[PDB]
Amino acid sequence: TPVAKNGQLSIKGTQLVNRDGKAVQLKGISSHGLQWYGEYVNKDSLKWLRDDWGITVFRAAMYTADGGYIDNPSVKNKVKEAVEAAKELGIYVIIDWHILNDGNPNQNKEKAKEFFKEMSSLYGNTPNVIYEIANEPNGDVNWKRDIKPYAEEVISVIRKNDPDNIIIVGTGTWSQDVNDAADDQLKDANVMYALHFYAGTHGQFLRDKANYALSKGAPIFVTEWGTSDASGNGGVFLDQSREWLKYLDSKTISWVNWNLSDKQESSSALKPGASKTGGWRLSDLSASGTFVRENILG
């Protein structure tokens, strides 16, 4: 199992590497918002994904807004649950401070810093953990004015308890505007920038900004991508999805598919009715779910 095999991750240039300094490409899946679908996120289902799908990373998508942590912080217990499972299973785990309607990460910066102080404190001696501090900036929200200053403060409070675990920072326009990041990069040695795409929506233009970012030295991590369109629908777009994953392989970019749930949308891995604890029949999986599993089992 990884972490037992790769240990603690760091960044060599653009390439995510293991403790040996080997190139590593994590592949996995994200929960839906933990406030609605945390029932699917537990040591059993995570175990099933590890054992049946070969996932090497699980993302715990803790919405801040929309009935999430700001209004009900007890959801932090689901993050802690998933993390303990990940440590116990030898897989990596992303703690995703999942902004969306609160499109400016500054809106909730005080609560975000307090949240990350506790997590880095609890888990910062843990090689499993990756922090994702701001899922998707959007609106009149840009790198230089809004996202960078936030990242320095939040980063500064994480590094106190955890100096070396990977931190992934979202970018503008729903974690598309990596080029703006790529120009005015942070100094932290273990920071990556998030790139999100949907196969039914995003095409070559988004890949080019990504190419531009790498060429300027900014590492990229796909903390969220879907085989559906950006709404999370439109059916399951196999040509573009195949085309995207081909591109990501070519640069050894780690990725996390959206999403593990039985929600009634195209992006869901599961068909309605699917067990919360795994042990899923091949039929229980959606058209999306099947494709994603096939692309992790190599």
From Swiss-Prot:
Reactions listed under catalytic activity: Endohydrolysis of (1->4)-beta-D-glucosidic linkages in cellulose, lichenin and cereal beta-D-glucans
Keyword Ribonucleoprotein annotated: no
The EC number(s) this enzyme carries: 3.2.1.4
GO MF annotations, alphabetized: cellulase activity; cellulose binding; glucan exo-1,3-beta-glucosidase activity
Source superkingdom: Bacteria
Record: residues binding substrate: H32, W36, Y37, Y63, H98, Y198, A230, S231, W258, K263, Q264, E265
GO biological process, one term: glucan catabolic process
EC top class named in words: hydrolase
Residue numbers annotated as active site: E136 (proton donor), E224 (nucleophile)
Keywords linked to the UniProt accession: Carbohydrate metabolism, Cellulose degradation, Glycosidase, Hydrolase, Polysaccharide degradation, Signal
Family of the protein in this entry: Belongs to the glycosyl hydrolase 5 (cellulase A) family.
Protein name as catalogued: Endoglucanase
Phylogenetic classification of the source organism: Bacteria, Bacillati, Bacillota, Bacilli, Bacillales
Range covered out of full length: 34 to 331 of 499
